[PDB]
């Protein structure tokens, strides 16, 4: 259960990840989208603030990847990228499971 | 990142998940281990307390999954299952990255 | 599986020792003993490695670490390289087996 | 250091591994080749024990394939692979010619 801003921020971080793994710099349009524009439930289900907390993490991870890159700091760059990647897999998984619409349909009548 | 109590609790929850997914009940020793015994970092790396928050989330998801198998509510016994599965993949991925030993070795001499 | 906690500790220490021995350093006395560890059934029916097989190769690695050190003092350059190559290949093997055994993502089935 | 029997059994086990990763069967000629006939370095008996282990894993993998046990098949495959990588690294190190040569004069 993402909100629109969160889905837009997530997809922006997934694109930022791909460019950073290809050494590329980030367009300022993308840099800002990466940054964007109660915390724990009773069941254990994730909450909107939990989602925003992880997306804010990702934004900071991205700042760290670029700083490590631009200083040639290599192994630290990869530990950040692997943390980012694991977060994005997690958020992408939750986003798809809740937004998916085929699985709401029964068999043909 | 992970301490040993947490690694142990994660493993028990993974094992609990597999039994619950194949409709079994949980042994007493596993029902105990899945319970065990701020939150944000400046760089975005997950923190011990974030890890423990999700492990507690998972224990409450496991309690709800066990109930909906005695409450007959088949449908939400699977949204809980899918939330627990995605959490376990995430924690397992972080735990495997930290504990990995082959990455600590250089290339051949 | 087959790794116990003492072996995982001995294997980390040997990996640490390996690098120090590759960057010319000597090993502190603490680490020289962490590499020995503390203190039959060597083959299994299926071929899976056994605890005793792991322990024998960790002990071999300790002897290799000792041959490496001694031959670094005596500058035996060509001795040192063959020992280092054997140690490296053992540590990669033990590290791969330890990782596979401890790996927790592979324990999880497909999404529901 | 390997002997020629071991090198031949190792190459056959490397071949057998690839075919099994493709669900294919093993010609009897390969199956038989896969079976064969203080300082810390590896010894020839240690080499043979691991080649013997690999034959036993291959039997377990084939049996786990035929009987459809997929999770078990891949755990043996992972163990056989790690053994093969290890024996191959050692055999390649001992036999490698180019690393013996200095830089151009």
Curated annotation (Swiss-Prot), chains A, B:
<feature type="short sequence motif" description="SH2-binding">
    <location>
        <begin position="80"/>
        <end position="83"/>
    </location>
</feature>
<comment type="function">
    <text>Appears to function synergistically with RBM14 as a transcriptional coactivator. Isoform 1 and isoform 2 function in nuclear receptor coactivation. Isoform 1 and isoform 2 function in general transcriptional coactivation. Component of SWI/SNF chromatin remodeling subcomplex GBAF that carries out key enzymatic activities, changing chromatin structure by altering DNA-histone contacts within a nucleosome in an ATP-dependent manner.</text>
</comment>
<comment type="subunit">
    <text>Interacts with MLLT10. Isoform 1 interacts with RBM14 isoform 1. Isoform 2 interacts with RBM14 isoform 1. Component of the multiprotein chromatin-remodeling complexes SWI/SNF: SWI/SNF-A (BAF), SWI/SNF-B (PBAF) and related complexes. The canonical complex contains a catalytic subunit (either SMARCA4/BRG1/BAF190A or SMARCA2/BRM/BAF190B) and at least SMARCE1, ACTL6A/BAF53, SMARCC1/BAF155, SMARCC2/BAF170, and SMARCB1/SNF5/BAF47. Other subunits specific to each of the complexes may also be present permitting several possible combinations developmentally and tissue specific.</text>
</comment>
<comment type="similarity">
    <text>Belongs to the SS18 family.</text>
</comment>
<protein>
    <recommendedName>
        <fullName>Protein SSXT</fullName>
    </recommendedName>
</protein>
């Amino acid at each position: 259960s993402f909100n629109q801003n969160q889905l837009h921020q997530l997809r922006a971080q997934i694109m930022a990840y791909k460019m950073l793994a290809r050494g590329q710099p980030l367009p300022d349009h993308l840099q800002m989208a990466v940054q964007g524009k109660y915390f724990q439930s009773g069941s254990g289900e994730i909450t909107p603030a939990a989602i925003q907390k992880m997306l804010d993490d990702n934004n900071h991870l991205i700042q760290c990847i670029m700083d490590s890159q631009n200083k040639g700091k290599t192994s630290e760059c990869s530990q950040y990228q692997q943390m980012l990647h694991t977060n994005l897999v997690y958020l992408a998984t939750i986003a798809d499971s809740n937004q998916n619409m085929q699985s709401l349909l029964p068999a043909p009548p």
